[PDB]
Amino acid sequence: KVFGRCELAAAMKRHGLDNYRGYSLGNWVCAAKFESNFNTQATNRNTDGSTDYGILQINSRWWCNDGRTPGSRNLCNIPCSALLSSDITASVNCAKKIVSDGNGMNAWVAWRNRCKGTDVQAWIRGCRL
C-alpha cells in the first residue's frame, strides 16, 4: 500500500506513534516518506545483506527476521514480511522498539539526513489527524 501523507499520519497516530519517544507525527511521516515513500511494500537490500522492510525500512540486521540475514537479530520478533503489510501495526510496533533503542530516530538514516531538524510539521500540515 502506498499511503497518502495524511493517511499515513492518521494511521501512525492511530497506532500511537504521534509523539512516541517524543517524536512528533511529522517526524515519523517524514521518515516514512524518505524511507519508503509511504509504500508499505518497500524493501531495499543493504550492502551487508540485510534488507530494510516496509514503510519505515526496518532492517532485518536487527529488527525482523527475513531468514537471510546471517547473524541478524529479530528484535521486533516478527518476520520482516509483516513489515510490508498494508496495515502498519507491525511496522509501528517495531519502529517503537527501534526508536526506543537509544538513538531515537537517528536509527533511520533517511530521517537523520532528511527529516531531522527540518520543519517536519509540514508532513502533517493540513491533515485531519
UniProtKB/Swiss-Prot annotation:
GO biological process, one term: defense response to Gram-positive bacterium
Pfam families per record: Lys (PF00062)
Classification via Gene3D superfamilies: 1.10.530.10
One Gene Ontology cellular component annotation held by this UniProt entry: cytoplasm
EC numbers for this chain: 3.2.1.17
Similarity-based family: Belongs to the glycosyl hydrolase 22 family.
Name of the protein: Lysozyme C
Species whose genome carries this gene: Gallus gallus
